[PDB]
Design an enzyme around this catalytic site. Structure first.
Site, PDB file in Angstrom:
ATOM      1  N   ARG A  78       0.850  -1.170   0.000  1.00 19.60           N
ATOM      2  CA  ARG A  78       0.000   0.000   0.000  1.00 19.60           C
ATOM      3  C   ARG A  78       0.902   1.241   0.000  1.00 19.60           C
ATOM      4  NH1 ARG A  78      -1.708  -3.679   3.710  1.00 19.60           N
ATOM      5  NH2 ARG A  78      -3.792  -4.672   3.443  1.00 19.60           N
ATOM      6  N   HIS A 138      -3.950   2.362  -5.191  1.00 23.99           N
ATOM      7  CA  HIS A 138      -4.177   0.927  -5.091  1.00 23.99           C
ATOM      8  C   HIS A 138      -4.070   0.166  -6.412  1.00 23.99           C
ATOM      9  CE1 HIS A 138      -4.774  -0.530  -1.126  1.00 23.99           C
ATOM     10  NE2 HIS A 138      -5.737  -1.382  -1.426  1.00 23.99           N
ATOM     11  N   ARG A 161      -1.502  -2.755  -6.711  1.00 19.59           N
ATOM     12  CA  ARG A 161      -1.873  -3.841  -5.798  1.00 19.59           C
ATOM     13  C   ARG A 161      -2.989  -4.668  -6.457  1.00 19.59           C
ATOM     14  NH1 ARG A 161      -1.033  -5.301  -0.515  1.00 19.59           N
ATOM     15  NH2 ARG A 161      -2.746  -6.190   0.709  1.00 19.59           N
ATOM     16  N   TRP A 190      -2.092 -11.211   2.595  1.00 18.54           N
ATOM     17  CA  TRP A 190      -3.474 -11.568   2.905  1.00 18.54           C
ATOM     18  C   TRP A 190      -3.550 -12.899   3.649  1.00 18.54           C
ATOM     19  CZ3 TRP A 190      -3.179 -10.273  -2.744  1.00 18.54           C
ATOM     20  CH2 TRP A 190      -3.588  -8.943  -2.998  1.00 18.54           C
ATOM     21  N   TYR A 243      -9.942  -8.615  -4.441  1.00 19.68           N
ATOM     22  CA  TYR A 243      -8.943  -7.983  -5.323  1.00 19.68           C
ATOM     23  C   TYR A 243      -9.055  -8.379  -6.784  1.00 19.68           C
ATOM     24  CZ  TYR A 243      -6.796  -5.136  -1.861  1.00 19.68           C
ATOM     25  OH  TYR A 243      -6.547  -4.103  -1.006  1.00 19.68           O
TER      26      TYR A 243
END
Ligand code: VO4
Ligand code: VO4
Lengths: 322, 322, 322, 322
Positions: C154, C270, C273, C296, C305
């Site tokens: 992040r 983001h 990611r 995660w 995601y």
DNA sequence: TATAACTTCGTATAG
DNA sequence: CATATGCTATACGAAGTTAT
DNA sequence: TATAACTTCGTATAG
DNA sequence: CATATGCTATACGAAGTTAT
DNA sequence: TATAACTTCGTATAG
DNA sequence: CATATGCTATACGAAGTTAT
DNA sequence: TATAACTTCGTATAG
DNA sequence: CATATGCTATACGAAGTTAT
């Protein structure tokens, strides 16, 4: 007190909520505890912490295993908790003594044992020795060992397989539907795939036994001394006999076990489950796939199974040599 | 009430429920907490939430690691739980302040450390420097380092090995049975096999030391200034001395420690376990195999050791370098 | 009532237990709610259930997002729960209207949005375009995008990286230690490996910027008008500026975003990611490896995601056109 | 008693907190539970644990599936929780019987069912059997089956598609925008692309039906016996009619289904989802891509669908066939 | 003093 | 976001409805 | 007057 | 398959800042 | 009436 | 066995101890 | 006789 | 690494059982 009786009756009424093995050990432990209470002038129920403490100390002095002693404590805990009463283990006296008995026994050399591994090299050795036998008992046993090794199923699960649980992949491989295991109760269940080779061993057994004559027949059945199989939809081959298959197979190759009375001198019911877990670790199979193979949900339980990985052929010896 | 007094007597009576190492830390935390309490006019027992909170802030101010601070909380929690009193952790004040402290120390750049790795390259270098040494001291120390790296036993377990625990494999290797396992279910197994090369180092120490004159003797013993070994069945070499061997070996190759006062500037008790784990990763040994070789059950313990290895760089790197 | 006051005092005094962003949103919600209360003659605290329900419905009529309305509810719940008071959500009027608002808004077309993917193809394209530039600003921005994509970190985590957090693998790949993420606060932390190509981009940034003068400097820093980097150990490049690198890089390739007022028309914080997660899914990376990459702990967050994987080049279209 | 009355009124006021399908089940279970109570002279509200227990045993004896029995318990639970009452589930008696019922049903051989797969081979076969038809009904049905298989959308989701949700990519393909997502966070994405072939099927239907006259028209509509389509912007084809398409298509090929009133003897609304998941697994599409293709969030739903493919046979099969 | 290239901040919304 | 705890969809036979 | 081709409904069970 | 709990992030326009 | 090849059982111990 | 929750080791500088 | 080579110990911290 | 909780399995010697 009326509540206590209610609570025990409610527990007894819904008996089948628990494994029959949970009941068997509850009763076995109650019998052991009540007999000790009678001889030592104590009240068996409700159990007093100091009395339980003394009883656990007596089990330790008998030289019983830590896990045995824990099982006695645990059954006593359950009987109280489910009555609505404090557990023995709710008191320092009991919980600390159990900790103490464990540390002391371990410090004196105790560790939990594990079935002798029945591994891929063992399966291949047994296969080559027995594959040509046309005795119904040998056909059966080889199919049994194949399934045991291929699926890692516990012996009780294998005993419960019915013909109708067997289906097929497009590519010809057998699939065994399993709905109940030690840790799974589900109408969805799992399918356990057999390889082409193990599929063939099972088909040979299905073919000479005639168990397919009725799809409610259990897959495995007894074979009497005239080489004739006795299929049945109501009685399973006992898990005792499945243990015996492992023991007789070990005896075939290595001769009679000695007389020391220790456990696991020969293969037993859990031997292929332990063996396959080890082979998978050695082959580099990923944790999630080992998990799926054995029906496990975490890594700790996998470590429990592979803990006795042969050291002499282990990573560190191979790295240091050659 | 008088309940706490009885609870504490039960703790004393069954004090073997906890390791000697646990008691020593409980007392050490209790001295620190009581000293601080006396200084700040606070009652030390039962511990009041606001007071524990201030104490923990003082531990932070002192420069103690997060994990040290957890030890103090944990020890106070245990005293209270086993007293039948409320735990400091179960309060709003303590819960919040621990959350704060962890966050602040991490942002301030506090880092968990691990043992400097003693790897195959290190072992080889030391071998090539020492294997010809005449000195009894050197013959011992090389055999120690070889066993440490080969088996991944902890120093306390190496200190415990007795001559009688050693036998020979059909391959001619030494096999070390674990007399006392760390836990009831021994994740590392019940035996450790030594490679042919490490077997030679150990044979050398045994013949030169005279420890085999008596099977009950510990494998490792002290060696006095005159180079005479003193075998014993009653006294182990201290874990302290075993750490001193790692440190003295490091000093031999790299000279005296830097002066920063940091931990792990030289090899220590854990160094050969970290190294072996790394060498196994480099060779593509799977994680579960690495874990049972060293007796680990937590994946992240091992990951900490191996995460800076190219073989462990992960999917994104692999994806990009394709 | 004295107790409520003490409870809030205790929350504020260990305010650092919580994220600055949690406090920021607590205050933002309180003034919205207190202002609505003022205007509607309600008591802002303790909040009565019928008034909170009225407020939530007003947030709904204002056309605000479901997640926004949940944020307002959630902040009120925390204020109350950490006061030791009943939460608004402990009443049916409130928990029910929250479900209702979310159901109605979804039924009416609302779905949670997601950052526009920045994927491997985008990275290669930007690299191909920018790798020859000698402007400090470009060298920085390319190193940033490389880290963002390679590590999935992040932007706040990227902004906190200091020069000292950077080490190397034996094969020369860069490693970045990260101690604090959105979900992890640990002195062990995590190590993020960079490919050789990305490593080389960061090295170029380090050499042109001089951030390596002080190991305490943040890796990324502002670059002024004159093309000169201003390294600092005291101020991070803001997360707002890091969003700006993404937005500017998107403008470089696709020009100005349109005027929808809608979020995510251009790349944002983001984006890499999300794009990395998607590339990993498409490449057949195992769920554990995807999990490790993103840090995660479960499959549902992974699905969060990858949920907008392109369907035109998805599996079904490809299968049907074969 | 006034609190419960308010609690229920609150439930009525915010009706829309739950799906119409949830309410329909609450009422259905309440009818069954209240009818059984009247017969057995028990008070239906509040529900007592002993009574709920007897009721659950009655549902078991009726031959209802475990999941149905859980639905009945779950709905009584919700009604009691949203009333502010003890939940039947939070009692010893109910806990114990559910555990017992689960075990006994699994042991009796109860198996969870699954939609008959509608796979690529079924879709191709249907297309080649029907593609010569110029009937409005057949042309619609073909387009419906194509969308079902291509997109993995649920029947309720296909029924809601409006003509204005359809746009064109630069590939020439139809792209269906999802106007109403299943959840706030849409696992399946916000759009579904059609293959060129399935685009052609849908173009044909649009052209013969006239749905494109008003972009607000639902894509699918009824077709009366004279082969005339009735486009509508306010009325959907019911999900029951869509199930009927799958059912009629199966009947055309295989004829009338069995007397044995089992479920899933013909294709149904879930069939194309199960079929497409299986074809993806056969092609080697990863589990996560399969899951996002169908909007699944739980890996074991998908595994249920594909567990009998040779591709999914596990590590032990791989080891044994090597 | 003019501006590139940020920072800070609030409401808003995602993870 | 990591965790905690049920809700919300399809299945299908039957019965009602409406234009042929 | 028959009928196709739906829709509505209530219970059963999977996602 | 779903939504809740108690967080902790990112999104982005706008307005303020500072070393050229 | 043997006997192989089991089953039943209760305690002991692992998972 | 799946699950929930703290205990038990090593690190190391310093101060003692004992046979050379 | 110093002294190598330990052992014991207490606080700090990792497994 | 570690061990508790509340189970649910296997281990195995002994003794009993039934088609040959
Ligand atoms: O930020 V979510 O990984
Ligand atoms: O039987 V334990 O897997």
């Amino acid at each position: 007190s009326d509540e206590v009786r209610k609570n025990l009756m409610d527990m007894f009424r819904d008996r089948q909520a628990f494994s029959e093995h949970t009941w068997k050990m509850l009763l076995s432990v109650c019998r052991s505890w009540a007999a000790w209470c009678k001889l030592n002038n104590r009240k068996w129920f409700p159990a007093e912490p100091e009395d339980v403490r003394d009883y656990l100390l007596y089990l330790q002095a008998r030289g019983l295993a830590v896990k045995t002693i824990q099982q006695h404590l645990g059954q006593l805990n359950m009987l109280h908790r489910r009555s609505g009463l404090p557990r023995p283990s709710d008191s320092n006296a009991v919980s600390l003594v159990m900790r103490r008995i464990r540390k002391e026994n371990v410090d004196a050399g105790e560790r939990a044992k594990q079935a002798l591994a029945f591994e891929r090299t063992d399966f291949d050795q047994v296969r080559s020795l027995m594959e040509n036998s046309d005795r119904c008992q040998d056909i059966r046993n080889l199919a049994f060992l194949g399934i045991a090794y291929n699926t890692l199923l516990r012996i009780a699960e294998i005993a419960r397989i019915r013909v109708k649980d067997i289906s097929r992949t497009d590519g010809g491989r057998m699939l065994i539907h399993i709905g109940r295991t030690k840790t799974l109760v589900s109408t969805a269940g799992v399918e356990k795939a057999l390889s082409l080779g193990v599929t063939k061993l099972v088909e040979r057994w299905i073919s000479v036994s005639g168990v397919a004559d009725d799809p409610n027949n259990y897959l495995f059945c007894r074979v009497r001394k005239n080489g004739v199989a006795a299929p049945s939809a109501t009685s399973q081959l006992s898990t005792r006999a499945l243990e015996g298959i492992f023991e007789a197979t070990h005896r075939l190759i290595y001769g009679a076990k000695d007389d020391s009375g220790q456990r696991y001198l020969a293969w037993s019911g859990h031997s292929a489950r332990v063996g396959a877990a080890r082979d998978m670790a050695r082959a580099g199979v990923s944790i999630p796939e080992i998990m799926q193979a054995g029906g496990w949900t975490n890594v700790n339980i996998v470590m429990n199974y592979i803990r006795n990985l042969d050291s002499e052929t282990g990573a560190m010896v191979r790295l240091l040599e050659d």
